[PDB]
């Protein structure tokens, strides 16, 4: 987006003063929409020396005469040209500026406009800038951040030592990665994206997007009236073990609840019996195992079951021992169908086997599984969208890195999901997702499309739960899926 | 306002490009508010070469990519610098321009944005500019005018040969006289006034204003709980004749319905009896006349009645003969109280008598009475606010020049009233107004204040009539007055 401001000035010819004005009035209009009539309020605008602060000067000037009181605390040393121009206007219009922050100054104001730093922040905040941010965060005033809350790194969502907690953030052109990933997404509060005059072609060129309702609506597969179950595909789910008898059932119904025509589970006996006793619509094939786990002895039976299907999901509750490893790796090596690879199938995966596969795969790890897979720490991989991009690209796969914001990438295109809530922070929610992806592939969506639609809907179903989110369980989530789908349309 | 754009650029330092951008986006936002989501519509923007057309180019550019189709028909020869800059941007953003108008081009569009001429129009429109305006007016498309509908003279409201009929007009800073006076007020349609960044001090400096709800609310006199009728003043109304027995009654009740404590009429016998039989709250003093009209023989009796009062209204239904002339002029010469002078009192008035009076007066003519008074044609005086200013100033009075837009001036301050409807186009509505002004003066408002509040409320009461306005009569209007007052608060 830095390149987008640049191109809009330098090649399209839009004066940078005009972009700055449009940004500032956007902020004024966003505050009106959120606070109602502004004439009642007193405003403290905190301006740095960069263009973020310039945006602040525009806000401050625009509020002059219309609101109860305005004051600018200017906290930079030097001003950029556009910041300077606008400082100059604010002063000519009769606005008051000071350069010293008094702790007690929060006393006489209702709204703090945070125009200290924007996407123009490198490295940690210390000294007075930090002190003032800590003061604002303790003040209980309403906080409006210009562009990104000061102290968020706009490329990662990381807090650079300290950062402003905003009630409202007004950004320009497009959401930035920092608003989308945590902790930054938390500090952004309610996010508005303002159009400030960039050519639309540039806005759309952006290589990374947030999954939206509109995007998902247009990817949902059609339901032609003259159809039968085979129209909507077949899934095989290879899952469960004597230790984990629930996982297969939740994956299976994830597939069915998104509109798949037929789902078959392959689960060690007698645990296979659990599924059909809960959901007799499922087919649950007994696999005869030595000790409760899949092994190479079950390889041939599973390839056979996979000839009549469109997609295979593998992993949930398989257990992670050597015989499961041999089986999963030999199976994936021979299976010439799309694979959705989750949970324990990921823990035992040999990534050489993903490269040599002609057929496509989706991997769906959480950060702990991603860490072990690439042999890094949880902290190195969490929210690391470039690492996810490299891995999908190197292994010719779609990677769905699960978290409160989920990342879906194929190496070229990267998408971020922001639906869901803490109710999904419970075992078995992941199992449902695996099933949703496989089902959507079965219905003819590509792996990336299936993954995009599934993470969105999976989160949206969680938000539809009637009671406190913390009491949500995977079985209730399954029930809410078709409501999510209906509400999408 | 031309001086206001100039000062904001040249002394405050706001780039004129920024004013132009702010104007253009205002227009976009006004259309969204009026038409709802704009993505459904096709736009034809008609641009001249001046700054009005520049504003158009900004609108057109801003609609690019967001709406169904945009096209600019550019109709000037040369472009001003700011128009040129913006033509340049529109073209860079990928916008299509043509320079020839095809009659059939209205076919492929839903909205015509009229940015042909603004306040920068001298003299009559002819040739193609006219043809194109006549085409747009016949087209039945939705029309949005930038600043003023092209062809209105913004200083008078006159149609310069021909002019655009808009559904919506978006103007900047302040309403212009042209939007406020007819025919221009009719062609403006729904008027929005946009703030485009002028310093508030300049906006407020403007010497001429529209009467607003807010202004009138803050002028309404207080009603202290510990009060009695004398707190709210006494009015004497000198009116009626054997020919016109209704006028006194309607003026009298105009005074009472605005909260006056006591109203006395002086009306020739027996016509005085009419008032109390309709409204027995009135005092109606029989005046003994020779032939049904006031004359000098009634001078002493009337000065006597006027000692116990705060204001005297004179004129309605007096008749216009020589003996009435002698009486009115000798009376006004000796009366040392505020006078409200209406109707026949105006027809017989010697204006030398207004200069020599120490006490204040309000005159309330319609254009026919104003014409005869200053010895000009109805067409020279109608909507002629500068003539009204000169006259109030030369005669030390407030002049209230009645019409669908009423002008109230004291020579320094001029106000325009825009309430009311065609239901007041009926005899006797004027009589009610005279009474309202006198009553408000009686309650302690100055003549200009009393006049401002009265014309506003008089019109607002008309709009509250439940049935078709054309069936409104003065007696129903009287009944609606206190509803108007309540709705004001």
């Amino acid at each position: 987006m830095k390149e987008i401001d640049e191109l809009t000035i330098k090649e399209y010819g839009v004066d940078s003063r005009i972009l700055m004005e449009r940004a500032g009035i956007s902020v004024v209009l966003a505050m009106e929409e959120e606070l109602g009539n502004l004439s009642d309020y007193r405003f403290l605008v905190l301006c740095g020396g960069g263009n973020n602060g310039g945006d602040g000067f525009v806000v401050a000037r625009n509020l002059l005469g219309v609101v109860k009181d305005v004051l600018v605390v200017f906290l930079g040393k030097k001003k950029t040209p556009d910041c300077e121009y606008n400082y100059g206007l604010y002063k000519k219009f009769g606005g008051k500026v000071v350069e010293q922050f008094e702790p007690s100054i929060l006393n006489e104001f209702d709204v703090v406009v945070d125009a200290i730093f924007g996407t123009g922040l490198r490295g940690e905040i210390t000294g007075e800038y930090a002190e003032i941010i800590n003061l604002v965060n303790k003040s209980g005033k309403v906080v409006v951040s210009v562009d990104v809350p000061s102290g968020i790194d706009s490329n990662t969502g990381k807090v650079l030592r300290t950062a402003v907690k905003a009630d409202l953030t007004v950004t320009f052109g497009v959401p930035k990665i920092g608003h989308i990933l945590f902790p930054g997404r938390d500090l952004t509060g309610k996010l508005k994206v303002a159009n400030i005059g960039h050519p639309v072609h540039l806005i759309n060129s952006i290589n990374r997007y947030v999954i939206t309702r509109e995007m998902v609506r247009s990817l949902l597969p059609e339901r032609p009236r003259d159809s039968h179950k085979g129209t909507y595909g077949k899934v095989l789910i290879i899952a469960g073990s004597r230790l984990y008898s629930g996982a297969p059932v939740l994956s299976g119904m994830g597939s069915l609840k998104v509109g798949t025509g037929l789902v078959k589970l392959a689960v060690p006996f007698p645990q296979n019996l659990i599924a059909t006793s809960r959901f007799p619509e499922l087919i649950s094939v007994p696999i005869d195992t030595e000790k409760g786990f899949f092994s190479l002895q079950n390889l041939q039976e599973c390839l056979e079951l996979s000839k009549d299907v469109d997609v295979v999901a593998i992993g949930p509750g398989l257990g992670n021992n050597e015989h499961v490893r041999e089986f999963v790796n030999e199976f994936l090596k021979t299976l010439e169908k799309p694979a959705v690879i989750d949970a324990d199938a990921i823990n035992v995966l040999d990534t050489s086997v993903l490269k040599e596969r002609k057929s496509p795969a989706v991997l769906t790890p959480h950060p702990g599984e991603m860490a072990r897979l690439v042999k890094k720490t949880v902290g190195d991989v969490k929210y690391n969208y470039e690492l996810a991009e490299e891995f999908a690209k190197e292994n010719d796969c779609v990677l769905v890195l699960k978290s409160a914001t989920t990342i879906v990438t194929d190496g070229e295109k990267t998408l971020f999901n922001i639906t869901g809530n803490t109710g999904l922070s419970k075992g078995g929610s992941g199992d449902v997702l695996t099933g949703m992806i496989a089902g959507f592939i079965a219905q003819g969506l590509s792996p990336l499309e299936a993954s995009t639609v599934s993470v969105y809907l999976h989160g949206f179903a969680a938000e539809l739960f009637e009671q406190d989110e913390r009491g949500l369980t995977a079985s209730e989530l399954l029930r809410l899926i078709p409501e999510a789908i209906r509400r999408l349309k | 306002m031309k001086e206001i754009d100039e000062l904001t650029i040249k002394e405050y330092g706001v780039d004129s490009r920024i004013l132009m951008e702010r104007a253009g986006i205002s227009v976009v936002l006004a259309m969204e508010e009026e038409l709802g989501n704009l993505s459904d519509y096709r736009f034809l923007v008609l641009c001249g070469g001046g700054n009005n057309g520049g504003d158009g180019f900004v609108v057109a550019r801003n609609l690019l990519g967001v709406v169904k189709d945009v096209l600019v028909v550019f109709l000037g020869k040369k472009k001003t610098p700011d128009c040129e800059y913006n033509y340049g941007l529109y073209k860079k953003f990928g916008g299509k321009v043509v320079e020839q108008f095809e009659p059939s081009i209205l076919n492929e569009f839903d909205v015509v944005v009229d940015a042909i001429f603004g306040t920068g129009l001298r003299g009559e429109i002819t040739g193609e500019y006219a043809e194109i305006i006549n085409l747009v007016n016949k087209s039945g498309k939705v029309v949005v005018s930038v600043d003023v509908p092209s062809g209105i003279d913004s200083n008078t409201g006159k149609v310069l040969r021909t002019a655009v009929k808009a559904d919506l007009t978006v103007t900047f800073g302040v309403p212009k006289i042209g939007h406020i006076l007819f025919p221009g007020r009719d062609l403006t349609g729904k008027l929005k006034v946009a703030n485009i960044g002028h310093p508030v001090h300049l906006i407020n400096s403007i010497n001429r204003y529209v009467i607003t709800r807010e202004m009138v609310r803050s002028l309404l006199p207080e009603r202290p709980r510990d009060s009695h009728k004398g707190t709210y003043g006494k009015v004497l109304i000198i009116a009626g004749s054997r020919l016109y027995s209704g006028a006194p009654v309607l003026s009298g009740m105009g005074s009472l319905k605005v909260g006056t404590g006591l109203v006395k009429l002086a009306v020739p016998f027996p016509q005085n009896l009419i008032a109390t039989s309709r409204f027995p709250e009135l005092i109606s003093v029989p005046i003994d006349t020779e032939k049904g009209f006031f004359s000098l023989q009634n001078l002493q009796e009337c000065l006597e009645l006027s000692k116990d009062v705060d204001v005297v209204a004179i004129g309605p239904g007096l008749g216009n003969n020589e003996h009435v002339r002698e009486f009115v002029n000798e009376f006004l010469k000796t009366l040392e109280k505020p006078a409200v002078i209406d109707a026949d009192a105006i027809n017989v008035l010697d204006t030398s008598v207004l200069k020599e009076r120490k006490s204040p007066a309000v005159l309330t003519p319609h254009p026919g009475e104003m014409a005869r008074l200053v010895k000009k044609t109805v067409g020279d005086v109608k909507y002629n606010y500068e003539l009204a200013e000169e006259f109030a100033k030369e005669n030390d009075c407030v002049l209230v020049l009645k019409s669908a837009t009423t002008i109230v001036t004291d020579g320094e301050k001029t106000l325009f009233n825009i309430t009311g409807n065609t239901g007041l186009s009926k005899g006797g509505s004027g009589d009610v107004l005279t009474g309202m002004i006198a009553g408000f003066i009686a309650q302690g408002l100055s003549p200009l204040e009393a006049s401002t509040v009265s014309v506003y409320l008089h019109g607002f009461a008309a709009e509250l009539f439940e049935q078709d306005e054309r069936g409104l009569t003065a007696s129903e209007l009287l009944r609606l007055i206190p509803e108007a007052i309540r709705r004001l608060k």
Partner: peptide, 6 residues
């Protein structure tokens, strides 16, 4: 919808 995505 013209000014803001939410």
């Amino acid at each position: 919808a013209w000014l803001f995505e939410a």
